[PDB]
Design a protein around this ligand. Structure first.
Ligand SMILES: CCC1(CC)C[C@@H](C(=O)NCc2ccc(C(=N)N)cc2)n2c1c(Cl)nc(NC1CCC1)c2=O
Ligand SMILES: [Ca+2]
Lengths: 254, 55
C-alpha cells in the first residue's frame, strides 16, 4: 500500500495473509469461518500446493502476539474463464482445511447480494484497501498491515482520466478503477488478493479485490480491482457444494 | 422501490408486486419490526469491527 497508514490492530479483522513455504504471497478476505476470497493470479506459479497457508488475525509480521490463526488451504477454486498470466476474471475462492475461530481480531467481511452491490454499494465513493505489500513502487513491503481510502470511478471516466499507454490491458466489465492519478496513493504488488471494502449504513462489504495496475501510484493511472459483484452467484453456489479432491479446481463461469 | 435509496433497507431489498417491498439481512442478522433495520444475532457478525463496536 502506497500513501496509506497502519491499520490499527484489529480494525482490519477480515484481512488474510497468504504464505507459500513461509514466504508472503498475497492477501485475501475472510467472508465466513472457512472461505477466503483472493485473486486468481496469486496462484499462477504455485507448484507446492501443500505449502499454502492462510493466516487470520495477523498484524505485525515481526512478532507473534497470539491472535494469529493459521490454516492450510484445502482448495483453491478459480473461474474457468481466467487465463493465467492475464488480467480478466482475477478472482479465487479458497476453502480452509479447518474453520478459523471468530474473535475480536478475526471477523468475516460481508459478501453482499449482487443487486445490493450493483445498485447501492457501487455508488459509495470511498472504500478501504489493505495489505502488507510494497510501501512504494520498487520499494520494500510493510511489516504492519497498511490501509488506504480510495475513491471509485466509472470505467468511462477511468479511461478518459488515464494517460494512454496503448499496450495496457482493457478494463472489462469484471473490473473497476479506484484511487488517484497524481502518483500519491495506490495499492501495490504484494497487496494482490486483498479486500476493497465498502461501508454502508454501519456495516462493511466486499466490493473489490486488489488485482492489477501500471506500476504503483504511477502518475496518470489508477488501481484496477476485480468487480466482486459479477461473481456473487458463482461464489455462493461453490460455497454450498461438497469439496472435491485435489487442491486446484477450475469451476465453470458463469 | 429497491432501486431508489435501497428501498429504505439497511441491508438487502426485494421488490414485490406494486409498492410492496421486503427488506432482508445477511446471515447473523435479524430484521427489526420497522421492516428496514438489521440487528446482530451472533457475537461476531460479518462487517462489524469488534474493538470499535465495543468502544
Ligand atoms: C493480473 C495478472 C498479472 C500477471 C503478471 C498480475 C498483476 C500484478 O502484478 N498485480 C500486482 C499489482 C497490484 C496492484 C497494483 C496497483 N493498484 N497499481 C499493481 C500491481 N498484473 C498482471 C498483468 Cl498481466 N499486468 C499487470 N499490469 C499491467 C498494465 C501495465 C502492465 C499487472 O499488474
Ligand atoms: Ca504477528
Amino acid at each position: 500500500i502506497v500513501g496509506g497508514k497502519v491499520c490499527p490492530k484489529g480494525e482490519c479483522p477480515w484481512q488474510v495473509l497468504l504464505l507459500v513455504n513461509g514466504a508472503q504471497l498475497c492477501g485475501g478476505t475472510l467472508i465466513n469461518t472457512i472461505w477466503v476470497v483472493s485473486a486468481a493470479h496469486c496462484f499462477d506459479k504455485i507448484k507446492n500446493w501443500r505449502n499454502l497457508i492462510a493466516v487470520l488475525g495477523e498484524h505485525d509480521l515481526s512478532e507473534h502476539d497470539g491472535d494469529e490463526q493459521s490454516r492450510r488451504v484445502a482448495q483453491v477454486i478459480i473461474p474457468s474463464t481466467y487465463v493465467p498470466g492475464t488480467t480478466n476474471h482475477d478472482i479465487a475462492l479458497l476453502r480452509l482445511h479447518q474453520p478459523v475461530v471468530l474473535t475480536d481480531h478475526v471477523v468475516p467481511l460481508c459478501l453482499p447480494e449482487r443487486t445490493f452491490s450493483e445498485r447501492t454499494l457501487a455508488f459509495v465513493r470511498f472504500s478501504l484497501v489493505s495489505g502488507w505489500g510494497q510501501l512504494l513502487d520498487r520499494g520494500a513491503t510493510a511489516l504492519e498491515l497498511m490501509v488506504l481510502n480510495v475513491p471509485r470511478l466509472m470505467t468511462q471516466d477511468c479511461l478518459q482520466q488515464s494517460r494512454k499507454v496503448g499496450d495496457s490491458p482493457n478494463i472489462t466489465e469484471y473490473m473497476f478503477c479506484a484511487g488517484y492519478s497524481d502518483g500519491s496513493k495506490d495499492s501495490c504488488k504484494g497487496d494482490s488478493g486483498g479486500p476493497h471494502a465498502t461501508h454502508y449504513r454501519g456495516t462493511w462489504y466486499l466490493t473489490g479485490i486488489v488485482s492489477w495496475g501500471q506500476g504503483c501510484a504511477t502518475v496518470g493511472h489508477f488501481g484496477v480491482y476485480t468487480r466482486v459483484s459479477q461473481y456473487i452467484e458463482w461464489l455462493q453456489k461453490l460455497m454450498r457444494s461438497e469439496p472435491r479432491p485435489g487442491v486446484l479446481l477450475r469451476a465453470p463461469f458463469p | 422501490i429497491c432501486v431508489n435509496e435501497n428501498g429504505g433497507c439497511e441491508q438487502y431489498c426485494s421488490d414485490h408486486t406494486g409498492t410492496k417491498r421486503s427488506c432482508r439481512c445477511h446471515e447473523g442478522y435479524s430484521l427489526l419490526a420497522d421492516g428496514v433495520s438489521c440487528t446482530p444475532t451472533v457475537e461476531y457478525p460479518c462487517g462489524k469491527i469488534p474493538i470499535l463496536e465495543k468502544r
